[PDB]
Design a protein around this ligand. Sequence first.
Ligand SMILES: OC[C@H]1O[C@H](O[C@@H]2[C@@H](O)[C@@H](O)O[C@H](CO)[C@H]2O)[C@H](O)[C@@H](O)[C@@H]1O
Length: 504
Amino acid sequence: MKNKVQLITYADRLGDGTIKSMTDILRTRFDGVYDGVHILPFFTPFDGADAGFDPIDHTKVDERLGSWDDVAELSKTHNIMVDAIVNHMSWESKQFQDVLAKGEESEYYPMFLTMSSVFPNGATEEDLAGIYRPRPGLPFTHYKFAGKTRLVWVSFTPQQVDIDTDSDKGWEYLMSIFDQMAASHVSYIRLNAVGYGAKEAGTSCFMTPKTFKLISRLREEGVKRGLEILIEVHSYYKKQVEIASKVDRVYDFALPPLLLHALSTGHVEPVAHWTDIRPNNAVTVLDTHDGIGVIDIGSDQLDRSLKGLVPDEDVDNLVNTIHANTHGESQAATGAAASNLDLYFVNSTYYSALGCNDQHYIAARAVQFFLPGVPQVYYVGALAGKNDMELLRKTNNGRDINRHYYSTAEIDENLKRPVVKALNALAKFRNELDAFDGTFSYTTDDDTSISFTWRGETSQATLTFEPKRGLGVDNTTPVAMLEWEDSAGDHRSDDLIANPPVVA
Ligand SMILES: OC[C@H]1O[C@H](O[C@@H]2[C@@H](O)[C@@H](O)O[C@H](CO)[C@H]2O)[C@H](O)[C@@H](O)[C@@H]1O
């Protein structure tokens, strides 16, 4: 995966509302800034309950958005990342509809998992109780095959039926997705919900050996088509290091909340700790299309005794710090959970989570770009967007607070702001300076300061980070100094907004 900054965006929420318009905005307004892009699900349909992650036909672009040729067109300039939903598919798909009509006579009957598929011999209470769950209840719902009532395995919603990833039809389906991705010259594949993709009795059915056997089989099938794979997994941070050592690339879900903590308090030990242990085969982010994950830093869900990178109280304070900085907007968006250790995510834009503080925000991006891994910037964050209460009150969907529809007018208006111009100049710096293709090193004091250093062939750069120097939502004190060496010798920048860095 190229070591340049990528953009995460919906096709219809960045420009006129299509892949062509998205590609236009990308090329015209962000040349040299984002040379790659993760296009969020654009299949048939894209405007369902789960905003593209519940497609009926994974193989077909939503004709309202464009076509696969638009993807191929965009590939001539930008590396493209796309989601591959491997765990499940729509019950409205023709494959599953056929199983309902024809039952065991159906061509696709082996393609879908049932309780019998995994538990031919009966299941105990411990068998079903130990299954890892992202959603409440048991992962089963009622469907009638021909006329016989059956318990179909469903990890998320009853409308998304899990497929047998070891069956021929299920695998044939996954390869139809891969073949279309490779046909349109997609570079990277984000394997959605792959952690649940393998079921075996007696296990949690989440990241078991059979799961790593599936990821490796999908890897080899991908390279055979020129496709690199990436796994998305939210879990306890020690499981994250375990997983990252067995796969090609993972997400760094710990950093976003860790930077919210450090910018809220000033304590940099948790960040220095994470820097030392984190997997470096990662994709770094601050915001995503979902809420801010706090589970990731992050007591274990099943066994509270395993403590995260900060005490449970600092996790509670982090959730409440977001509620305060947004003045209750994220409360309206986040459904209460009685306690904050029971929260998965907090719904708010990352800019608003910082109280819209420019100095704090640019610093967070700077740290993101200076840690090993390929950085991504979510489109709302690329525009330093605030929470969208109107869409939230229209759709009643919590995550829409961080999914604003940006017309080309709104993009060019927000492009006039200095914080936006600083981020663009920062990504260009991150892409243009060849120091980042070299070797990484870091130093720390104790709690006040931490310095991130990259030294390459023709260039060097160091980022020092002192959140102590400026505390408060309304504090304008720069908390990140930058020094770097290039063709024009040694240079410095003590303010990354007013004095954004440039390369020779
Ligand atoms: O389709 C449901 C969601 O899938 C992805 O997010 C999941 C996350 O919410 C949690 O359940 O963990 C799993 C496995 O790590 C994630 O796949 C999408 O990112 C999300 O947008 C979908 O709603």
